[PDB]
TrEMBL record, chain L:
GO biological process: translation
Gene source species: Saccharomyces cerevisiae (Baker's yeast)
Residues noted as binding Mg(2+) in the record, renumbered to the chain: A171, N174, K176
Family: Belongs to the universal ribosomal protein uS7 family.
Ranges of residues in domain Small ribosomal subunit protein uS7: 57-213
GO cellular-component term (any): small ribosomal subunit
Alphabetical UniProt keywords: Metal-binding, Ribonucleoprotein, Ribosomal protein
PANTHER family to which the protein is assigned, alphabetical: RIBOSOMAL PROTEIN S7
Domain of life of the native organism: Eukaryota
InterPro entries: Ribosomal_uS7 (IPR000235), Ribosomal_uS7_CS (IPR020606), Ribosomal_uS7_dom (IPR023798), Ribosomal_uS7_dom_sf (IPR036823), Ribosomal_uS7_euk/arc (IPR005716)
Gene that this polypeptide is encoded by: RPS5
The protein's name in its UniProt record: Rps5p
GO MF terms held by the record: RNA binding; structural constituent of ribosome
RNA sequence: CGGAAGGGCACCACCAGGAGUGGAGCCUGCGGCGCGCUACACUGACGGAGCCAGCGAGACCUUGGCCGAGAGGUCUUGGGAAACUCCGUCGUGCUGGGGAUAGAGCAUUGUAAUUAUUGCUCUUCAACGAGGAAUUCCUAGUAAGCGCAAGUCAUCAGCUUGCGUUGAUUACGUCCCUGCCCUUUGUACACACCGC
């Protein structure tokens, strides 16, 4: 529920934070399954608006 | 004259003290009837 | 003999016996015509099945209804239940089953409690 | 008990669990051979499906749910004597 | 009992208390609740899967539960029984609420749409009714008392036309388009009906 | 008695006032026939019933 | 005044909200991208429309 | 009688179910 | 005392 | 004693429910600055209560 | 088939085929002054003596 | 062009059925007087919540509209208006009186404004439904009003309640009757007159919401 | 606006009211006392 | 007229019905705003139930209550018997540094059985297992009758 | 084709038959028609004091004919509504047997009704013919 | 001994409403506390007309005829309720809502003290102008309205208990508050989840 609640502004903020962790690899390999579960659920939930949006920086972040 | 049925007993301080003393005894003993669960 | 068919409508405590036979096309309730039912507002609540299905079938069919029990609203609902049950029973028996199914579909698409009784049995929480 | 199993089981007990005895017990047919003949002609049923053999020890729940088959002339004259025929159910 | 099909083993042999004989079964779509409907008790027993002990004994029928199923989107369950009734239970979320629908005769088979909005119920007269759940209303029925090829028995005393031995359908299933219905009973026929036009498409002997 | 139901009777012409009936209420009473009873409550509207 | 419509996507259960007030994700009926976490009062279910007077703000908690 | 009417069991089939003033009396 | 979701959002 | 009406009515609280629709609600505060009552009533609107 | 007439604290509507008092409007206080139907034949207006 | 001929004898009945009844079997109306076509909700977000599609003769279907959560929304609108009308101590259980009052009200509405009485009713409900409401945050003691939106089922319920309460209050102790005062209220709410009880109440509620939004 | 005077603190009607109120209170009190003593 | 006087219990799979006359009712509403009942699975106490009738009554009331309570269950319902007039009370108790100390709460009323029918209460024709006899000679002296 | 007051409504037939008896005049109303309260539970004598007796005559005729024979006690039980005790609850009260007897005697004088064996007042043949005539008249009142 | 976290339930909670009590009058259980009933009118009052039930079966009830405004009495026979529906009068005035109180008269019942009671008629027209502080109960054939019957060992007779009739508004979610409870060794057996 705590992941379903938040709006898309905080969803985009979440993805920026996830990219920052991917830069900071050691935290990623510390907490790989929690990060992956939260990321896959947040994109499955807000999938429609995220593919409806257009943001090249978001494209590079997702890549 | 005579009556025909049991008179309904009025509660007084003496009988309610006797009753709460009975409950005090029962609880202090921890011996009171309950519907215990069926085994097996 | 004469082809006849008897049905029953039942509201809360209103029984409505309905005899249906072939005839000149008259719909009589308690010896009175159907255009003189009691509460004068639910007259259309009792015209409902006739105007739903049309008037030619009732032009072919004779109908006698007698009603006992229940108050005014309960009696009107029992009358309309008995009329719909009698008409679809006569059509099931002495004319085509395709018209039986067409009548059943029309009646149950308008209001299902025309045909089958709504016994509002209780329930606890 | 188990003594009821060693003594109370009888040919009379199983033959009273038989079907036409149950029909006469539930007062469907007045006589046992009339119950037999009704089962032959096929005017009874047990739950969903109907029964044709008299040698049929009916179970407890199913003797609770035994009745006449629908649209049979015997049930028609039942409801005619009670004056409660309802041809919407084509009784 | 509950079988795996990867290790091929029991997990939990659910039961009641008095060893009562279960006829019909139904499962939750998510796989957490298992309901079984007996015939000698007319109470839908409901077990939870992972714990194993029975959650509840859903009572409310009069006479034995004839079929159970779960509509798998809303996760509701229909229970059809010889009280000439269908009973749509919703069992999740503090409510425990009931929707009783009456029919004309004894019901004996049930199926729900793959979308989970309608319920076809084949009764004893031979009509297959189709109900809308959210209104508890009748979308419509299809007759079946004609297009059934019953057989004669060699030990009979009547004809195979005026015999009501197998004049109904004790088994229904939908299509996965929600558009067809297969019906099969004790008769010698398997009928394939189409629902929106309400007419049979095929009959196999 | 001047008005009777099943197992209950309204009795008159025995006392003079509701005060008297309240003084005697709860009474093992009996009749000539040999059936037992009790007077139960003073009736209000007549004076002694 | 220009009012806007919005269709309910998803009721958000298990949030800590004041009694009677429900928190609901809505989406703009005009533009199917934008989703906003608004608040409702009456009984609501999914996929019914709902009128918004201000679109910018989003309804947070109420303790 | 009240017990019997409570257990009527309404499927019983018995085969019997298939069935001036002085001037008026004399004429009848 | 906040709720999950809220504390996640402010962090 | 005219037996025509109850004159002093203890009513249900509050004043806001037993008050007109369009109104101006003021309180005498001694530390608050001085206004003019006639200019105040004339600067108020037409169908208001005070 | 009908016409209205003013009278002493009263408005009376008569029919034509029977020539009889069909309707009586007597909700007034003092004597009425005018009675006039509408073009749709449904509303009548009654000018009274109280303004 | 192409025609279908489905009646061959002129239908006559041995019991005389009147001409108004035969025009009803031509087309079901309301009270055999008001048609249900071209009666559309003039605003979205409230269709499938104010139901005027399935036709009805009198507003007395006693169906079970209280088991599940939105059978009130499946109910016809006039039946709901009559049910909410028969609401007092002295009035409990007089639905024939509610039906008579509503029939008389529809007559008066059509007489004043010739458009359609049910169209006036539906437009009145759609207009006088509130739009935003202030719940009461306790705040640990500081009871303040916080603005939230409102579900359309609640909008319909509150619109019907406001109209009926306004009419009943307007004819509690007054020379007008409930019928004509309710016609007055419905016409004013259809206009958005701001002289009616329901429009004033809705306006004040939305004003407080706009204030402390 | 016409001023009015409130009353605060028929003769034979007041007397019969006092008499019957006294009789009511007296009868009820003595019947209660008698019933309790009899029990 | 507002004073409860009768209470009939029926066990439902064709079980027995006990009709009690309950006299000396005192409610929590009658007493005071004192809070609320603790509603925990309560302990049971039955005093002076001797004969077969007492066994029937204690079994009926026992199975009206809930089965298998906790050991430290807090509220105890007492059913005292004193000459055919059983009396019930709710009591919470804590074990002190030395002993027990109870607080009386709940309702407070003396009931007394006067019928025990075999069938359920719909019938009014089922057999009677026990019937209070009022107009007998020893009516004011006989206990458990 | 031959109709009856079974086929004709209640109110319109009663009004038409009372107006017919009014224009006929041969009814012999009693002298006390404008003081009588028609019941003990009523509050005032009837409003239209000119022809309420004629309406009662028509209603009694229709009621007998829809039934077969009735006594004055049966008509009292029929017409007597409930009363208003005021402070107490309400209860049932019978009607005014004097007015019922005067109505039945006047109708027997006209000949619409007649005496009936087993005791009673039944409808007569000529009166039945007149009732069916006025029923056909109010059926074809729509010209 | 105390705290924390997770979870469930509740018209003793929230939310939305309804209907009462507390104001007047009458009645009635408690000694001021409490329960019922009628009112405060136009969704009504009053007058005609229409008519629809169920539970009940130990000198009496009666069908019918008579006279009497009514109340009633008289002579004969055997052992189908109200609210409601329609038409009409009244219209906002403590008015015709209301019927307390009082007077007069007519009849019945016991009986003999010009005794008490009941029912009817006419006249007189009080309080009551929608009920503060507070408080209670309630989620569907439910709240509320309306009558009918019976007193079948406890309780009841200006009352209890059954019975039918008319029949709704609003939640059907949430633990946010006020509480109450459960858990903090999966123990149980697959997949999955969690891991002091």
């Amino acid at each position: 529920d705590a992941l379903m609640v938040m709006p898309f502004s905080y969803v985009l903020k979440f993805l920026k934070f996830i990219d920052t962790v991917m830069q900071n690899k050691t935290l990623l390999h510390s907490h790989l399954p929690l990060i992956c579960k939260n990321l896959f659920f947040i994109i499955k939930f807000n999938h429609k608006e995220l593919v409806s949006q257009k943001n090249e920086e978001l494209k590079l972040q997702i890549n | 004259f005579d009556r025909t049925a049991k008179p309904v007993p009025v509660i007084t301080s003496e009988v309610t003290e006797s009753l709460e003393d009975m409950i005090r005894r029962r609880i202090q003993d921890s011996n009171f009837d309950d519907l215990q669960r069926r085994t097996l | 003999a004469v082809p006849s068919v008897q049905t029953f409508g039942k509201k809360k405590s209103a029984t409505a016996v309905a005899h249906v036979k072939a005839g000149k096309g008259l719909i009589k309730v308690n010896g009175s015509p159907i255009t003189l039912v009691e509460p004068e507002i639910l007259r259309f609540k009792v015209y409902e099945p006739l105007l739903l299905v049309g008037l030619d079938k009732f032009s072919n069919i004779d109908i006698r209804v007698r009603v006992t029990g229940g108050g005014h609203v309960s009696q009107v609902y029992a009358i309309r239940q008995a009329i719909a049950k009698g008409l679809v029973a006569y059509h099931q028996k002495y004319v085509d089953e395709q018209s039986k199914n067409e009548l059943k579909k029309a009646f149950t698409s308008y209001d299902r409690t025309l045909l089958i009784a709504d016994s509002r049995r209780p329930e606890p929480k | 008990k188990i003594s009821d199993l060693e003594n109370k089981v009888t040919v009379s007990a199983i033959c009273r669990r038989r079907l036409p005895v149950i029909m006469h017990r539930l007062k469907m047919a007045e006589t046992i051979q009339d119950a037999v003949k009704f089962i032959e002609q096929g005017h009874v049923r047990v739950g969903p499906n109907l029964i044709n053999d008299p040698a049929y020890l009916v179970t407890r729940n199913m003797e609770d749910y035994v009745t006449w088959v629908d649209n049979s002339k015997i049930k028609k004259t039942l409801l005619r004597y009670r004056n409660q025929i309802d041809d919407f159910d084509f009784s | 009992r509950a079988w795996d099909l990867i290790r091929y083993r029991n997990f939990r042999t659910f039961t009641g208390t008095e060893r009562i004989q279960f006829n019909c079964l139904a499962v939750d779509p998510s796989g957490e609740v298992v309901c079984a409907g007996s015939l000698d008790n007319f109470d839908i027993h409901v077990w939870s899967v992972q714990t194993g002990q029975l959650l509840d004994a859903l009572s409310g029928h009069e006479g034995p539960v004839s079929c159970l199923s779960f509509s798998q989107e809303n996760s509701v369950l229909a229970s059809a029984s010889w009280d000439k009734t269908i009973r749509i239970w919703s069992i999740f979320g503090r409510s425990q609420q009931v929707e009783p629908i009456e029919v004309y005769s004894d019901v004996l088979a049930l199926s729900m749409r793959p979308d989970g909005k309608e319920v076809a119920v084949s009764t004893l007269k031979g009509q297959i009714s189709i109900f809308n759940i959210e209104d508890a209303k009748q979308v419509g029925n299809i007759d079946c008392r004609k297009d059934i090829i019953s057989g004669r028995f060699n030990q009979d005393r009547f004809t195979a036309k005026n015999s009501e031995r197998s004049k109904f359908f004790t088994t229904i299933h939908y299509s996965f388009d929600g558009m067809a219905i297969v019906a099969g009973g004790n008769n010698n026929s398997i009928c394939l009906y189409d629902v929106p036009n309400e007419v049979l498409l095929k009959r196999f002997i | 008695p001047y008005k009777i139901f099943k197992n209950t009777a309204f009795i008159k012409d025995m006392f003079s006032s509701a005060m008297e009936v309240a003084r005697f209420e709860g009474a093992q009473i009996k009749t000539v026939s040999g059936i037992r009873g009790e007077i139960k409550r003073a009736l209000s509207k007549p004076e002694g019933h | 005044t220009p009012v806007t419509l919005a269709k309910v996507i998803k009721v958000l259960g298990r949030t800590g909200s004041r009694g009677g007030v429900t928190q609901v994700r809505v989406e703009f009926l005009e533009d199917t991208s934008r989703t906003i976490v608004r608040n409702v009062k009456g009984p609501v279910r999914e996929n019914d429309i709902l009128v918004l007077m201000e679109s910018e703000r989003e309804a947070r908690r109420l303790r | 009688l009240r017990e019997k009417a409570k257990e009527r069991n309404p499927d019983e089939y018995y085969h019997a179910m298939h069935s001036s003033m002085d001037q008026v009396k004399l004429l009848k | 005392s906040l709720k999950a979701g809220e504390r996640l959002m402010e962090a | 004693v005219n037996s025509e009406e109850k004159l002093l009515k203890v009513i249900k609280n509050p004043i806001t429910d037993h008050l007109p629709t369009k109104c101006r609600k003021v309180t005498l505060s001694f530390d608050a600055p001085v206004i003019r009552v006639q200019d105040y009533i004339e600067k108020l609107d037409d169908d208001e209560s005070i | 088939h009908d016409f209205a007439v003013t009278s002493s604290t009263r408005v009376q509507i008569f029919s034509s085929r029977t020539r009889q008092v069909i309707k009586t409007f007597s909700r007034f206080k003092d004597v009425v002054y005018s009675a006039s139907f509408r073009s749709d034949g449904k509303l009548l207006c009654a000018g009274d003596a109280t303004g | 062009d192409f025609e279908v001929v489905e009646e061959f004898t002129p239908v006559v009945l041995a019991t005389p059925i009147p001409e108004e009844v035969q025009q009803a079997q031509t087309e079901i109306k309301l009270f055999n007087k008001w048609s249900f076509e071209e009666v559309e909700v003039k605003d979205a977000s409230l269709v499938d919540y104010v139901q005027v599609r399935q036709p009805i003769f009198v507003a007395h279907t006693a169906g079970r509209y209280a088991n599940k959560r939105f059978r009130k929304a499946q109910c016809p609108i006039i039946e709901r208006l009559t049910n909410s009308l028969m609401m007092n101590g002295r009035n409990n259980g007089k639905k024939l009186k509610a039906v008579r009052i509503i029939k008389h009200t529809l007559d008066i509405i059509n007489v004043l404004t010739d458009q359609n009485p049910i169209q006036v009713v539906v437009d009145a409900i759609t207009n006088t439904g509130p739009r935003e409401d202030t719940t009461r945050v306790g705040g640990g003691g500081a009871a303040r009003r916080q603005a939230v939106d409102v579900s359309p089922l609640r909008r319909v319920n509150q619109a019907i309640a406001l109209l009926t309460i306004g009419a009943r209050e307007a004819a509690f102790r007054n020379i007008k009757t409930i019928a004509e005062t309710l016609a007055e209220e419905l016409i004013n709410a259809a206009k958005g007159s701001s002289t009616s009880y329901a429009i004033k109440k809705k306006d004040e509620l939305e004003r407080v919401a706009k204030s402390n939004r | 606006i016409p001023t009015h005077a409130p009353k605060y603190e028929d003769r034979t009607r007041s007397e019969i009211n006092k008499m019957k109120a006294q009789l009511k209170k007296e009868r009820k009190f003595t019947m209660k006392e008698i019933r309790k003593d009899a029990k | 007229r507002g004073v409860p006087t009768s209470l009939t219990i029926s066990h439902f799979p064709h079980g027995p019905t006990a009709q009690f006359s309950l006299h000396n009712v005192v409610m929590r509403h009658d007493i005071i705003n004192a809070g609320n009942q603790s509603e925990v699975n309560p302990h049971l106490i039955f005093d002076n139930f001797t004969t077969a009738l007492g066994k029937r009554v204690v079994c009926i009331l026992k199975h009206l209550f809930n089965a298998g309570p906790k050991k430290d269950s807090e509220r105890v319902i007492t059913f005292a018997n004193r000459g055919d007039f059983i009396s019930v009370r709710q009591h919470v108790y804590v074990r002190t540094r030395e002993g027990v100390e109870i607080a009386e709460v709940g309702p407070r009323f003396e009931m007394r059985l006067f019928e025990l029918r075999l069938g359920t209460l719909e019938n009014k024709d089922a057999d009677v297992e026990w019937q209070l006899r009022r107009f007998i000679r020893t009516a004011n002296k006989k206990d458990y009758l | 084709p031959g109709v009856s007051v079974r086929d004709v409504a209640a109110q319109d037939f009663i009004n038409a038959y009372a107006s017919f008896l009014q224009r006929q005049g041969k009814l012999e109303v009693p002298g006390y028609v404008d003081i009588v309260k028609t019941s003990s539970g009523n509050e005032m004598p009837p409003q239209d004091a000119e022809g309420w007796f004629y309406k009662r005559a028509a209603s009694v005729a229709r009621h007998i004919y829809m039934r077969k024979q009735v006594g004055v006690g049966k008509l009292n039980k029929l017409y007597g509504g409930a009363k208003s005790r005021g402070v107490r609850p309400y209860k049932h009260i019978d009607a005014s047997g004097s007015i019922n007897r005067k109505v039945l005697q006047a109708l027997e004088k006209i000949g619409i009704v007649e005496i009936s064996p087993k005791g009673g007042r039944r409808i007569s043949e000529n009166g039945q013919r007149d009732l069916d005539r006025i029923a056909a008249q109010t059926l074809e009142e729509d010209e």
